[PDB]
Amino acid sequence: GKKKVCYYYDGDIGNYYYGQGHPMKPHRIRMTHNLLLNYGLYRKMEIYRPHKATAEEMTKYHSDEYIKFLRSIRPDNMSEYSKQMQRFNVGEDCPVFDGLFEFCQLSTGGSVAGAVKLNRQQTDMAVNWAGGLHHAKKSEASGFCYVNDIVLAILELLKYHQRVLYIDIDIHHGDGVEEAFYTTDRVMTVSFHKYGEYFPGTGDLRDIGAGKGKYYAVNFPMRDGIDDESYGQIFKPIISKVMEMYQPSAVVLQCGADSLSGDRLGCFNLTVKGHAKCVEVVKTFNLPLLMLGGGGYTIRNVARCWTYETAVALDCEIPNELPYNDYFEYFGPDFKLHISPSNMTNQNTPEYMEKIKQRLFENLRMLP
Ligand SMILES: CCN1CCC2(CC1)C[C@@H]2C(=O)N[C@@H](CCCCCC(O)(O)CC)c1ncc(-c2ccc3c(=O)n(CC)ccc3c2)[nH]1
Ligand SMILES: [Ca+2]
Ligand SMILES: [Ca+2]
Ligand SMILES: [Zn+2]
Structure with missing residues (x-):
C-alpha cells in the first residue's frame, strides 16, 4: 500500500556554484523543492534537513x-x-x-541519514535529490562528483542488510559505485547507460564483476535516442529477474535525470513518465528504498522529473498544469509538468534491446 516517505533537503544547497558555464547546477535541487512544495507534496512527507557529514563518516x-x-x-x-x-x-x-x-557534506549527509532511517525501520522510502554522485572514487574526484554519497549510504545499509541492490538510471555508467563493490556479492550493481564514445568509457556488457563479485555487476549498454517504449520493455524484465535471483533486502535507486529528452549533456529520448516508470517498477517490490538524484543538465526538466518521482513515491496524483512557483518563468512556454519526446532516431533497435537482455539473463542464470 501507501508508504511512509522521508525527504532530505537543506535550503542552502541551491547556493553552491560550480562556476560560469559548468553544466552541474545545484540550483536545480532548490527548483525541485520549490515545485514540489507548490504542488502540496509536503503534506504527506516527513521533511528533514540533513546533518553535515563529517570527514570521519x-x-x-x-x-x-x-x-x-x-x-x-x-x-x-x-x-x-x-x-x-x-x-x-x-x-x-x-x-x-x-x-x-x-x-x-550536505549531499552525503542526506544519503547517509536516509540509510540510517531505513535501517531503523522508521520509513519505507528515503529521498535525497542532492545525492547520487556515482563517479567519485576512493581517492579521486570524477565527473562532477567528489564524495561518493551512494557508496557511503550502501555501507550504512550493509550494517543491517545482507544483500543490497543498487540500480542506476543516469545516462552515464555508475562506475564509482560499481568499482567500490566489484569484488563482493553483498551488493549487486545494475547500470543502464549510454555506451560508446561517451564518459566515463566503462560499463561494457562484458564487465560482470570479479572474484566473489563475479555475476554481481550488471551493465546494459545503450545507444543514442532510447525512448519510453524501448526502455520500459527491458527495465521491468531485468529488474524482475534480478529481484528473483538476488533477493536483496534493501534497494538504492540513482534517478539521474540526464536520460530525459532534451538534456544538455545526454542523448536519450525519455519523457518524465518513462523515467518515473522505473521508480514505479522498483517501488512495486515493497523493499526499503533509498531514492537519489544524480545528473540532469536542462534544469527545468530535472525539477519536473524529480517532483513527479516524489509524487510517485507518495502514490499522489498531481496535475499536469504547473502551480505558480518561485521559478515559474523557467517552465515556459507551456507551463506543464510532463514533456514530449523529440523526433530523434532511436538507434537501439528492438532486436538489439532483446539481444542485450538475453545476454544479461544468461549471466543472471549463473547466480546461486
Ligand atoms: C572541460 C570539459 N572537458 C570535457 C571532456 C573531458 C575533459 C573535460 C574528458 C571529460 C568528460 O567527458 N567529462 C564529462 C563528465 C560528465 C559527468 C556526468 C555526471 C553524472 O551526470 O553522471 C552524475 C552527476 C563531461 N561531459 C561534459 C562535460 C563538460 C562540458 C562543459 C563544461 C564547461 O563548459 N565548463 C565551463 C568551463 C566546465 C566543465 C564542463 C564539463 N564534462
Ligand atoms: Ca547508469
Ligand atoms: Ca558487486
Ligand atoms: Zn549523468
Whole structure:
C-alpha cells in the first residue's frame, strides 16, 4: 500500500556554484523543492534537513588524504595545492569552488541519514535529490562528483542488510559505485547507460564483476535516442529477474535525470513518465528504498522529473498544469509538468534491446 516517505533537503544547497558555464547546477535541487512544495507534496512527507557529514563518516570509504584535501582546498589557496589537485583529479569537470566541502557534506549527509532511517525501520522510502554522485572514487574526484554519497549510504545499509541492490538510471555508467563493490556479492550493481564514445568509457556488457563479485555487476549498454517504449520493455524484465535471483533486502535507486529528452549533456529520448516508470517498477517490490538524484543538465526538466518521482513515491496524483512557483518563468512556454519526446532516431533497435537482455539473463542464470 501507501508508504511512509522521508525527504532530505537543506535550503542552502541551491547556493553552491560550480562556476560560469559548468553544466552541474545545484540550483536545480532548490527548483525541485520549490515545485514540489507548490504542488502540496509536503503534506504527506516527513521533511528533514540533513546533518553535515563529517570527514570521519566520509573516510568509511574515501582515503584520509583525499578527504583532508577536500576539507582544505579553496579558490584562494589553490596555488599551493597544484600537486594534490592533479593527483585527485580536481580540474575542469571537478573544480574548486567556494563551499565545496560543505556541498559534499550536505549531499552525503542526506544519503547517509536516509540509510540510517531505513535501517531503523522508521520509513519505507528515503529521498535525497542532492545525492547520487556515482563517479567519485576512493581517492579521486570524477565527473562532477567528489564524495561518493551512494557508496557511503550502501555501507550504512550493509550494517543491517545482507544483500543490497543498487540500480542506476543516469545516462552515464555508475562506475564509482560499481568499482567500490566489484569484488563482493553483498551488493549487486545494475547500470543502464549510454555506451560508446561517451564518459566515463566503462560499463561494457562484458564487465560482470570479479572474484566473489563475479555475476554481481550488471551493465546494459545503450545507444543514442532510447525512448519510453524501448526502455520500459527491458527495465521491468531485468529488474524482475534480478529481484528473483538476488533477493536483496534493501534497494538504492540513482534517478539521474540526464536520460530525459532534451538534456544538455545526454542523448536519450525519455519523457518524465518513462523515467518515473522505473521508480514505479522498483517501488512495486515493497523493499526499503533509498531514492537519489544524480545528473540532469536542462534544469527545468530535472525539477519536473524529480517532483513527479516524489509524487510517485507518495502514490499522489498531481496535475499536469504547473502551480505558480518561485521559478515559474523557467517552465515556459507551456507551463506543464510532463514533456514530449523529440523526433530523434532511436538507434537501439528492438532486436538489439532483446539481444542485450538475453545476454544479461544468461549471466543472471549463473547466480546461486
Ligand atoms: C572541460 C570539459 N572537458 C570535457 C571532456 C573531458 C575533459 C573535460 C574528458 C571529460 C568528460 O567527458 N567529462 C564529462 C563528465 C560528465 C559527468 C556526468 C555526471 C553524472 O551526470 O553522471 C552524475 C552527476 C563531461 N561531459 C561534459 C562535460 C563538460 C562540458 C562543459 C563544461 C564547461 O563548459 N565548463 C565551463 C568551463 C566546465 C566543465 C564542463 C564539463 N564534462
Ligand atoms: Ca547508469
Ligand atoms: Ca558487486
Ligand atoms: Zn549523468
